[PDB]
Amino acid sequence: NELSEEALIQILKEPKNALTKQYQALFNLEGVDLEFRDEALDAIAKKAMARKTGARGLRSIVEAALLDTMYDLPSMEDVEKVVIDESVIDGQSEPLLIY
Amino acid sequence: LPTPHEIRNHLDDYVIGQEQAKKVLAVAVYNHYKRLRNGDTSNGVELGKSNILLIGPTGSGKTLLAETLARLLDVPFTMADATTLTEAGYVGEDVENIIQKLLQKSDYDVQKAQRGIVYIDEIDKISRGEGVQQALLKLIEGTVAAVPPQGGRKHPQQEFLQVDTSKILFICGGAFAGLDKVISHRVETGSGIGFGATVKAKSDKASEGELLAQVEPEDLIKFGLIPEFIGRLPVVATLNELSEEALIQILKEPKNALTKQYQALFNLEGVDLEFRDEALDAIAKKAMARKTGARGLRSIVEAALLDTMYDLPSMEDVEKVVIDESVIDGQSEPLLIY
Amino acid sequence: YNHYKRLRNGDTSNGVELGKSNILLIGPTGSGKTLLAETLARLLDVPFTMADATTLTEAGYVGEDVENIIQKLLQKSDYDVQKAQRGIVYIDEIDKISRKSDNPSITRDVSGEGVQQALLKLIEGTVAAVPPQGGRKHPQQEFLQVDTSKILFICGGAFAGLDKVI
Amino acid sequence: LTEAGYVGEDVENIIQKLLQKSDYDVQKAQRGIVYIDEIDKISRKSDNPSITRDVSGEGVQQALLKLIEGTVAAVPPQGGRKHPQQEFLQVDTSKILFICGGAFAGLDKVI
Amino acid sequence: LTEAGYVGEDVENIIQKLLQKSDYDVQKAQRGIVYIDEIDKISRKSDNPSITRDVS
Amino acid sequence: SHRVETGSGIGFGATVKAKSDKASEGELLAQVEPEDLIKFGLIPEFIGRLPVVATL
Amino acid sequence: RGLRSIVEAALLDTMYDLPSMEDVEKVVIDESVIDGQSEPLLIY
Amino acid sequence: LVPMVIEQTSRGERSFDIYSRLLKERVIFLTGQVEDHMANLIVAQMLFLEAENPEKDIYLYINSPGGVITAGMSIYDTMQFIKPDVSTICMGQAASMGAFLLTAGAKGKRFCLPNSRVMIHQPLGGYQGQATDIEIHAREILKVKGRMNELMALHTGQSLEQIERDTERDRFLSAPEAVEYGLVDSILTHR
Amino acid sequence: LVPMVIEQTSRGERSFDIYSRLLKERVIFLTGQVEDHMANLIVAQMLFLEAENPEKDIYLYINSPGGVITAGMSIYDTMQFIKPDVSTICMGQAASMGAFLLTAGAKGKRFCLPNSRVMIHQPLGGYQGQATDIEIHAREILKVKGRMNELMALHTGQSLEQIERDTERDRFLSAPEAVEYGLVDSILTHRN
């Protein structure tokens, strides 16, 4: 059967090779923690349905939101953790940073 | 592995006018190299490859960005053309040959070859042979490729070297000229022929740059790209255009600038070479007329200096040579100093 | 589970032979059809490989031959026909092989119906000559005889438009 | 099976397989039985003009015409041990029984 | 010229021919010139079923 | 020619190109570019390695 | 060949869980099982 | 004979008539005397475009010496009913019914060419029969007159009294005069 | 009937109409009595060509005996509105309205055949009804007369007084006389 919006949200976190875990692992090895809030996860799934990209699109949506921070995170120092919210998903708001 | 900021700094010296695309390439290529740096992946979670998709006009610097990265971080680099694969016959043999070409520069080392950066161009052309995309997507997925070691008259079937393309970064460059219209129809007013419709095709091209930045998967499927292929290219970097002013900068600002290259050849000859500011725009004007972007710059200057290069060795005691806009036009001959 | 049990029947205390049962995964694109095949290779003990049906073509043409499928399965099996016979195979994009609408057959479809006619004997089980490595079918004396009777096949494709038919 | 001079397998490969069962004994193979499945597949596509060469189809049928009645087939000497001194085995198929079989889909419409 | 390992020819022999003219002196050999006539003839072609492989 | 051919118009004020002055080998090969050579079959990397082009 | 498909569907559920199930000595299939309304009877 | 135009896109090439090609651009051509059949065709175009996209604006080129009043109301009501803003551009001329549709366009999206002529007049009608039936039809047409004047006053912004005196007899107007009167918003002199 | 023609392009063979084929080359045919229906067809052709290439010129071939002013005036405003220049060629004849569109073409691009006849006259119309209505319609047509003469003087370059006197009655002008009057610029005698 075809995937649903709620199923896409589950795919973001429940799978062993979940996209959230992959990006978190990339941040964790760098030495900075990463956290994806529930509001951000639901927004990401909606964007995939809005663009009709589907399950594969999850990588593209996450890439845009973390594009700015990934570029500046190595240069920055004393960053204990990064947080993403629904506002950051659309792009209007800047990513929350924890020192 | 230099930081994303450092990668952009090095790219700025070699390429200019693509700062936005450089950031996308820098952060994306950094993560892939970081993934290779952390290739051990002791944890169960396995990081996924992020393939970049370059969308820009002809002669905008797509290819130059590929090899420049390899020069910074020594890794094998190979180029390919989608048009070559349009035949759609025995596509498997052609795609694995790309790995064989990469292995030639990687000393036929699977580990070193896996870290190479592959580049492809003219992707828009295949969009509509549809079959090539079906086979091409498998290469981006990451699959083992059987390649014979250093050629060889004959070798056992097992002897063939096996390289996994899962760890290779693929950059599928392209130039989607007609995609701008599709985006305007979705973002701007649908009308394109009425009185109210915006048909102000001044040809300035400034608006197209911002318009291409709003590229989404919806416009790609309209162009003919299959959704499966689009999904494997999450990262997208857009080059707007090379401006006439920027073309003047490209002539002299880059490290291995065209003027510096010719000056070096003339320097060993013993005669100084000079280019006036008016002369630089003349080359840019001729280059823009050709519509080949920065590619035409080499031909224009080469033709301008063809005559002097032939006769200047015969001339003796020539202390210096100067070039002006008239010389580029061809009406005049460059000044000679003694 | 049945696949492994069939291998366990090699003793053949009883003359009855356990015939295989192939699977046909029909689902929309992006539903994890390809993912299911990749997630099995991790635990699968027997050789497993993946291919694309679109590339395959009828014999005697420049496109491809169905016998090449076994070549990929031999790579994982270390080119050992003994163990390769007990492997599993996955064929993606089988939907494209469907016959075109109202074809008079004068066109002599190579990408479609021709591929199906060749696979028939392959799936049911028959000795298939396999080139040693990356070579076209030709008078070359060296050929690998691999029996597909025990090589299970799982054909997965997205039959777009089938919903309207149903 | 395909017509000679093309990528597909040659018709003579059948005699080679029969020899393998006979341990490359021409006498045993010459009196062996052969079965050809899916014979319906190699059929002209109801196109008598024959504008294009049907190498996999009509070409196979034409090649098979002389084999069934009898021909001095050529095959590798012994398991393709080596190319030097080929001395391709000569096998007469005049006494080799052939049993073709296939599912002729659409024949009912013709009858 | 043909692909290596075939009856036609090997590309590497071109360097050996240049040495014979210069008496195998690596110093002067590097300063030699090469002229490959009929270069267009080896232009890429599509695959042929009848032909075993496209060596050229 | 297919790439640099402007085409002949049909109107009264358009410019008609007769077969006599259609084109010639001279002045046509001079406008050769790497893209056209690739269609012939040459590898793009090979063309890039040959910047100097002498057209007769 | 169609016979195999019919039997596979009927025995799909039992084969899936019968190995894990304990103290099961025999299984019975009836006409209702072929229809799919009922599950095959399990003998313990 | 309408000419055929070829539209070239990545998917392929399609052939369309000149009117259908412009229809893709949300351009409807109102021409000739207004009637039930032509008006029904315009209505079908409005609904079709609304379905394709209910946000993009629709353009309407008006060139007609008026026509049936009932057919005109169908077009006017349809424009207001659908969410998309319907722009109106006067080409050549716009008589009583054409002018009513012209000024009925969305506020700020009403245009007219510099040499266009706009004429407005009261409704025209007639009935033959018994005196009792005449009184019925006379009241009906008078109600239509008051209703049309009220609608014209709303879009133009002129007072109802001013609209009544002006529309008692034929009043030819020019593009600049229409702007001050309120029938149109601006003139499209050049691009 | 209209004869079909084949256009050879890399995409494949394309069967075009004789008029549609010329429309692809930015050629518009204005033939017959000018009316609202044909004018909207020409207007659509102009707008379509503007979108394809606003830089390239458009060639309008005028062979007609004239017609309605309102319909003809919608074509004049369209030509001036669009950015591309509209070249006008006179074939056979160009009456009052056909001549206004002919002279309305882009400066330097207006052409006329050597044997073509260009006739210009003042607007003609009529009304029936009460005296009050006659005054309204009489004033309207006179304003149109001044409006048309003002524009005609602008393109031709002649003074308004001269145009008014010359257009008081039917005046036939040959191709060379039209050049001096200013209606056209050059005569296309033979292809060069």
Ligand SMILES: Nc1ncnc2c1ncn2[C@@H]1O[C@H](COP(=O)(O)OP(=O)(O)O)[C@@H](O)[C@H]1O
């Ligand atoms: N900023 C720049 N500095 C120096 N050279 C440039 C710059 N931009 C473009 N070029 C030159 O233009 C050429 C464009 O090549 P390529 O990217 O292959 O063309 P295309 O993108 O059309 O395929 C390069 O070889 C490069 O030398």
Ligand SMILES: Nc1ncnc2c1ncn2[C@@H]1O[C@H](COP(=O)(O)OP(=O)(O)O)[C@@H](O)[C@H]1O
């Ligand atoms: N439940 C799921 N969890 C994670 N990924 C999924 C899931 N379902 C589908 N996918 C995604 O779908 C992709 C594989 O599907 P695809 O190869 O497009 O199927 P097909 O090619 O047969 O249409 C994978 O990249 C995977 O990330």
